Design an enzyme around this catalytic site. Structure first.
Site, PDB file in Angstrom:
ATOM      1  N   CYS A  65       0.796  -1.223   0.000  1.00  0.00           N
ATOM      2  CA  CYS A  65       0.000   0.000   0.000  1.00  0.00           C
ATOM      3  C   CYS A  65       0.834   1.281   0.000  1.00  0.00           C
ATOM      4  CB  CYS A  65      -0.924   0.021   1.215  1.00  0.00           C
ATOM      5  SG  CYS A  65      -1.910   1.522   1.346  1.00  0.00           S
ATOM      6  N   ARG A  68       0.041   4.656   2.871  1.00  0.00           N
ATOM      7  CA  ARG A  68       0.187   4.450   4.314  1.00  0.00           C
ATOM      8  C   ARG A  68       0.537   5.665   5.172  1.00  0.00           C
ATOM      9  NH1 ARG A  68       4.258  -0.258   4.836  1.00  0.00           N
ATOM     10  NH2 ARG A  68       4.721   0.008   2.587  1.00  0.00           N
ATOM     11  N   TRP A 237      -9.516   6.400  -0.344  1.00  0.00           N
ATOM     12  CA  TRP A 237      -9.865   6.947  -1.648  1.00  0.00           C
ATOM     13  C   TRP A 237      -8.975   6.280  -2.689  1.00  0.00           C
ATOM     14  CZ3 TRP A 237      -8.223  10.085   2.412  1.00  0.00           C
ATOM     15  CH2 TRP A 237      -6.841  10.376   2.422  1.00  0.00           C
ATOM     16  N   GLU A 242      -5.370   3.203 -10.432  1.00  0.00           N
ATOM     17  CA  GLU A 242      -6.092   1.960 -10.176  1.00  0.00           C
ATOM     18  C   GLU A 242      -7.266   1.879 -11.123  1.00  0.00           C
ATOM     19  OE1 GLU A 242      -6.426   0.821  -5.732  1.00  0.00           O
ATOM     20  OE2 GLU A 242      -6.177   3.016  -5.736  1.00  0.00           O
TER      21      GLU A 242
HETATM   22  C1  HEM Z   1      -6.419   6.521   1.879  1.00  0.00           C
HETATM   23  C2  HEM Z   1      -6.200   6.191   0.593  1.00  0.00           C
HETATM   24  C3  HEM Z   1      -5.517   4.953   0.142  1.00  0.00           C
HETATM   25  C4  HEM Z   1      -4.870   4.831  -1.045  1.00  0.00           C
HETATM   26  C5  HEM Z   1      -4.765   5.914  -2.095  1.00  0.00           C
HETATM   27  C6  HEM Z   1      -4.338   3.515  -1.132  1.00  0.00           C
HETATM   28  C7  HEM Z   1      -3.657   3.038  -2.243  1.00  0.00           C
HETATM   29  C8  HEM Z   1      -3.478   1.681  -2.470  1.00  0.00           C
HETATM   30  C9  HEM Z   1      -3.184   1.086  -3.731  1.00  0.00           C
HETATM   31  C10 HEM Z   1      -3.049   1.824  -5.041  1.00  0.00           C
HETATM   32  C11 HEM Z   1      -3.070  -0.265  -3.555  1.00  0.00           C
HETATM   33  C12 HEM Z   1      -2.764  -1.308  -4.627  1.00  0.00           C
HETATM   34  C13 HEM Z   1      -4.065  -2.036  -5.038  1.00  0.00           C
HETATM   35  C14 HEM Z   1      -3.921  -2.881  -6.287  1.00  0.00           C
HETATM   36  O1  HEM Z   1      -3.161  -2.528  -7.219  1.00  0.00           O
HETATM   37  O2  HEM Z   1      -4.590  -3.947  -6.401  1.00  0.00           O
HETATM   38  C15 HEM Z   1      -3.269  -0.494  -2.168  1.00  0.00           C
HETATM   39  C16 HEM Z   1      -3.151  -1.747  -1.621  1.00  0.00           C
HETATM   40  C17 HEM Z   1      -3.487  -1.947  -0.302  1.00  0.00           C
HETATM   41  N1  HEM Z   1      -3.953  -1.035   0.592  1.00  0.00           N
HETATM   42 FE1  HEM Z   1      -4.052   0.875   0.425  1.00  0.00          FE
HETATM   43  N2  HEM Z   1      -4.656   2.829  -0.040  1.00  0.00           N
HETATM   44  C18 HEM Z   1      -5.348   3.627   0.810  1.00  0.00           C
HETATM   45  C19 HEM Z   1      -5.898   3.318   2.061  1.00  0.00           C
HETATM   46  C20 HEM Z   1      -5.827   2.073   2.680  1.00  0.00           C
HETATM   47  C21 HEM Z   1      -6.470   1.713   3.879  1.00  0.00           C
HETATM   48  C22 HEM Z   1      -7.377   2.629   4.680  1.00  0.00           C
HETATM   49  C23 HEM Z   1      -6.113   0.391   4.176  1.00  0.00           C
HETATM   50  C24 HEM Z   1      -6.537  -0.424   5.349  1.00  0.00           C
HETATM   51  C25 HEM Z   1      -6.844   0.066   6.565  1.00  0.00           C
HETATM   52  C26 HEM Z   1      -5.256  -0.045   3.099  1.00  0.00           C
HETATM   53  C27 HEM Z   1      -4.649  -1.285   2.979  1.00  0.00           C
HETATM   54  C28 HEM Z   1      -4.164  -1.736   1.738  1.00  0.00           C
HETATM   55  C29 HEM Z   1      -3.882  -3.159   1.539  1.00  0.00           C
HETATM   56  C30 HEM Z   1      -4.034  -4.270   2.550  1.00  0.00           C
HETATM   57  C31 HEM Z   1      -3.473  -3.307   0.263  1.00  0.00           C
HETATM   58  C32 HEM Z   1      -3.040  -4.599  -0.406  1.00  0.00           C
HETATM   59  C33 HEM Z   1      -4.131  -5.248  -1.246  1.00  0.00           C
HETATM   60  C34 HEM Z   1      -3.677  -6.527  -1.906  1.00  0.00           C
HETATM   61  O3  HEM Z   1      -2.673  -7.166  -1.507  1.00  0.00           O
HETATM   62  O4  HEM Z   1      -4.331  -6.962  -2.876  1.00  0.00           O
HETATM   63  N3  HEM Z   1      -5.092   1.017   2.231  1.00  0.00           N
HETATM   64  N4  HEM Z   1      -3.502   0.707  -1.500  1.00  0.00           N
HETATM   65  C1  LIG Z   2      -8.168   0.752   0.984  1.00  0.00           C
HETATM   66  C2  LIG Z   2      -7.834   0.771  -0.373  1.00  0.00           C
HETATM   67  C3  LIG Z   2      -7.653   1.960  -1.069  1.00  0.00           C
HETATM   68  C4  LIG Z   2      -7.318   1.892  -2.429  1.00  0.00           C
HETATM   69  N1  LIG Z   2      -7.134   3.035  -3.108  1.00  0.00           N
HETATM   70  N2  LIG Z   2      -7.192   0.703  -3.074  1.00  0.00           N
HETATM   71  C5  LIG Z   2      -7.413  -0.454  -2.418  1.00  0.00           C
HETATM   72  C6  LIG Z   2      -7.327  -1.728  -2.999  1.00  0.00           C
HETATM   73  C7  LIG Z   2      -7.574  -1.866  -4.351  1.00  0.00           C
HETATM   74  C8  LIG Z   2      -7.579  -3.129  -4.952  1.00  0.00           C
HETATM   75  C9  LIG Z   2      -7.203  -4.257  -4.231  1.00  0.00           C
HETATM   76  C10 LIG Z   2      -7.163  -5.513  -4.875  1.00  0.00           C
HETATM   77  N3  LIG Z   2      -5.793  -5.967  -5.161  1.00  0.00           N
HETATM   78  C11 LIG Z   2      -5.768  -7.237  -5.921  1.00  0.00           C
HETATM   79  C12 LIG Z   2      -6.417  -8.433  -5.219  1.00  0.00           C
HETATM   80  C13 LIG Z   2      -6.245  -9.516  -6.092  1.00  0.00           C
HETATM   81  C14 LIG Z   2      -5.127 -10.339  -5.959  1.00  0.00           C
HETATM   82  C15 LIG Z   2      -4.925 -11.405  -6.831  1.00  0.00           C
HETATM   83  C16 LIG Z   2      -5.843 -11.638  -7.848  1.00  0.00           C
HETATM   84  C17 LIG Z   2      -6.954 -10.811  -7.994  1.00  0.00           C
HETATM   85  F1  LIG Z   2      -7.874 -11.048  -9.013  1.00  0.00           F
HETATM   86  C18 LIG Z   2      -7.153  -9.745  -7.119  1.00  0.00           C
HETATM   87  C19 LIG Z   2      -6.879  -4.112  -2.885  1.00  0.00           C
HETATM   88  C20 LIG Z   2      -6.912  -2.848  -2.278  1.00  0.00           C
HETATM   89  C21 LIG Z   2      -7.642  -0.424  -1.047  1.00  0.00           C
HETATM   90 CL   LIG Z   3     -10.276  -1.442  -7.523  1.00  0.00          CL
END
Ligand code: HEM
Ligand SMILES: Cc1cc(N)nc(-c2ccc(CNCCc3cccc(F)c3)cc2)c1
Ligand SMILES: [Cl-]
Ligand code: HEM
Ligand SMILES: Cc1cc(N)nc(-c2ccc(CNCCc3cccc(F)c3)cc2)c1
Ligand SMILES: C[C@H](O)[C@H](O)[C@H]1CNc2nc(N)[nH]c(=O)c2N1
Ligand SMILES: C[C@H](O)[C@H](O)[C@H]1CNc2nc(N)[nH]c(=O)c2N1
Ligand SMILES: [Cl-]
Lengths: 362, 362
Positions: A65, A68, A237, A242
């Site tokens: 992420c 953070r 947000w 994305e």
């Molecule tokens: C506030 C604005 C936030 C932005 C702009 C942001 C941005 C992102 C982005 C761009 C990703 C990559 C997603 C992807 O490509 O599939 C991501 C992943 C992640 N974010 Fe954030 N995030 C935010 C807030 C949060 C919050 C509030 C949490 C949890 C409390 C969080 C936890 C995560 C986690 C766990 C992932 C990994 C998802 C995965 O492994 O598929 N994020 N974030």
């Molecule tokens: C909190 C938050 C904010 C933000 N801007 N984006 C996200 C977010 C977006 C997408 C995802 C999904 N990432 C991929 C999950 C996944 C993993 C492997 C295969 C798949 F088809 C899908 C997780 C978190 C989460």
């Molecule tokens: Cl999404």
């Protein structure tokens, strides 16, 4: 064995949590209490303070992420009191409403009762609370391909999609003791969507693209001090890429680059023309422009990377090791224009954290 | 111990090499010969066939290289016979001439005598045979910052740069037994350069950008069957992004994005305008256009990724494990538009291969 895993995780979490909260002197007595509670009940219950700080630490530790910097301002809603499907549904509706906040998005997490014997109390089927359905049959593809399996599962439960490219999936979740999940259609008044237009190119609206305002991840497990909160949806947000570089652009998603090239008036014939790259830039500009125009929060990848740099600096100042997954932190557009591209990150897993878990369908 | 490392590496290489060449029956006798030769001399000498195939295998095994589809057509020039600095210089001049081939670039490697006791016979100081000088003093920066240390070393040897932004560094290398390297100015008739213009935007030429035609890496060690060829310069043609997304765009290189934004008529004021991304796309289009117009070989990142996919397929068909470094294989522009972004690669090191080595200056 499981108890030992629980107790070891609890000791690590409580010590670290109370340190960060300036409560180090209370660690000893709290651990004794927990240790007794594990002995008798097989588990332990977090204080509201522990739960809130745990959810924040979990975000802080999420290697993939980029967002953070803002970990400490996460809004934590404690819904460990829910017992009925009506209560779950209403909590999810409320999450959408309060996170959306009329467009000024508030990063929020709603935490439901945790697993007991690895037995879930509430099992959420949705990948995100707001997401579009997908369909594929005898050659025809409609909507979001990534939602095909969940969409099919939903249509096994008596639901039927209109088969537009942007059908809102209903909330789908299962209660402990029920054999099948229930589903509820989303009140449209709760769901903000943004039509995609371009600041300069009037024809862009001909594509009739839109996306939903708030990404609310609802299928990951929050782990805090050995307690497994499998149902704990969280939102932030969007970062514009994305939507514009992946959701709308991937060949296995909405696959819009050729149509984008056409409406922006460039040929999509030769690799050397870099038409995909140009189309990607214009689509991403349109996404940012559109969310801004509608008053819905969004961040661009340059600003997001700059905030992440500050997160790195803050970690160093606080004396915390930084962990990150370089391959996920780099934005999918102009990655080398960000500082992230030019350094390395330790991808070690630190808890509390958010984890993938097996899907309950398919 | 070193002999054992040598013999073990030799056994692995000869077996694999002769397998691939359909010469498996000759492995036994060849190994005996080598084993005797190591016993007496402390080393062994590759046949021309072994050297050529070894250099090709080394390219095939280069995890960070997207261009590997063409590994088997590498032109290998055996210059293990050189003994004098005049011979080295002329071999390097010849490499430039034959690799350039009037613009139709031929991937080529020239192999000089290998290290003996870890003692180099020929020590090349240049990073690439053709590269621009860099200067920094009391605030003023001229040329390519990445060449600053080598440029300063050169100016310790009696050379002086004109201090344009594109001074060609001289060839610099040291012979065994000499205390200082010698330098030779590059004949300009040997060096193709490409002025950067844009297919649609006439003002782009106002930036007065150019780049050299042929990247010739001259500071890596080729390792084949335990033999260390520290001096073995090799070249291909450019992938456009190397020039347009990195050499000309990096803040610590030529840093041209703001100037690009200006000449293409967009503001460089707001992150949300994605002006850096747009400038990057136009600069990269201009690079490809310009090389094509001048009849100098180049590949765009989409075509390059497509060729790499074929390389993956060919590896599988031949029953060879594929290795790769995802973080280097993804192009720095629109990476998610390539198949590379969406899969993973085993980053294991397989020999023969090309390796970094310590610089002889700084
Ligand atoms: C506030 C604005 C936030 C932005 C702009 C942001 C941005 C992102 C982005 C761009 C990703 C990559 C997603 C992807 O490509 O599939 C991501 C992943 C992640 N974010 Fe954030 N995030 C935010 C807030 C949060 C919050 C509030 C949490 C949890 C409390 C969080 C936890 C995560 C986690 C766990 C992932 C990994 C998802 C995965 O492994 O598929 N994020 N974030
Ligand atoms: C909190 C938050 C904010 C933000 N801007 N984006 C996200 C977010 C977006 C997408 C995802 C999904 N990432 C991929 C999950 C996944 C993993 C492997 C295969 C798949 F088809 C899908 C997780 C978190 C989460
Ligand atoms: Cl999404
Ligand atoms: C024929 C056209 C070729 C293309 C388009 C190509 C493309 C590339 C690119 C884009 C890189 C990344 C460089 C960077 O970002 O710093 C690279 C790395 C590399 N290429 Fe190739 N390449 C080609 C031919 C060759 C040849 C002929 C060899 C050797 C026989 C070779 C060996 C390597 C090696 C060793 C690296 C890694 C450099 C490092 O670690 O810094 N390539 N290639
Ligand atoms: C044969 C060939 C073709 C082609 N198109 N590109 C190359 C090539 C380009 C650049 C490089 C240099 N890579 C970075 C070396 C490096 C590594 C670390 C720090 C530094 F300052 C520099 C290596 C190979 C090589
Ligand atoms: C720190 C990081 O490893 C570094 O910036 C790498 C990333 N990937 C790369 N990939 C290529 N092709 N070339 C590079 O110079 C780099 N730089
Ligand atoms: C195979 C590879 O790990 C996969 O494509 C990853 C690469 N990096 C990513 N980074 C982000 N932010 N999101 C993604 O979906 C991916 N996909
Ligand atoms: Cl280069």
């Amino acid at each position: 064995e499981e108890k030992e895993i629980l107790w070891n995780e609890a000791k690590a979490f409580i010590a670290a949590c109370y340190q960060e909260l300036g409560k180090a002197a209370e660690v000893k007595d709290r651990l004794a209490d927990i240790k007794s509670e594990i002995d008798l009940t097989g588990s332990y219950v977090h204080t509201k303070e522990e739960l809130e700080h745990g959810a924040k630490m979990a975000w802080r530790n999420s290697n993939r992420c980029i967002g953070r910097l803002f970990w400490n301002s996460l809004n934590v809603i404690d819904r460990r009191d829910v017992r009925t499907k009506e209560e779950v549904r209403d909590a999810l509706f409320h999450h959408i409403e309060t996170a959306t906040n009329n467009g000024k998005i508030r990063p929020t997490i709603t935490i439901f009762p945790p697993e007991e014997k690895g037995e879930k109390q509430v099992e959420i089927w949705n990948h995100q609370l707001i997401r579009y359905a997908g369909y594929e049959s005898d050659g025809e593809r409609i909507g979001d391909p990534a939602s095909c399996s969940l969409t099919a599962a939903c249509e096994e439960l008596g639901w039927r999609g209109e088969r537009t490219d942007f059908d809102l999936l209903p909330l789908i979740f299962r209660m402990k003791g029920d054999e099948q999940p229930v589903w509820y259609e989303l009140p449209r008044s709760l769901v903000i969507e943004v039509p995609i237009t371009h600041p300069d190119i009037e024809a862009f609206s001909d594509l009739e693209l839109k996306w939903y305002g708030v990404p609310i991840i609802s299928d990951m497990k929050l782990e805090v001090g050995g307690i497994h909160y499998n149902a704990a949806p969280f939102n932030g947000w969007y970062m514009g890429t994305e939507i514009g570089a992946r959701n709308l652009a991937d060949e296995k998603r909405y696959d819009k680059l050729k149509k984008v090239a056409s409406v922006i008036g460039i040929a999509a014939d030769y690799n050397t023309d870099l038409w995909k790259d140009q189309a990607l830039v214009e689509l991403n500009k349109a996404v940012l422009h559109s969310y801004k125009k509608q008053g819905v929060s969004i961040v661009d990848h340059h600003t997001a990377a700059s905030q992440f740099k500050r997160f790195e600096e803050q970690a160093e100042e606080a004396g915390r090791k930084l962990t990150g997954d370089w391959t996920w932190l780099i934005p999918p557009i102009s990655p080398a224009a960000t500082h992230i591209f030019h350094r390395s990150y330790d991808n070690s897993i630190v808890k509390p954290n958010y984890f993938y878990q097996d899907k309950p369908y398919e």
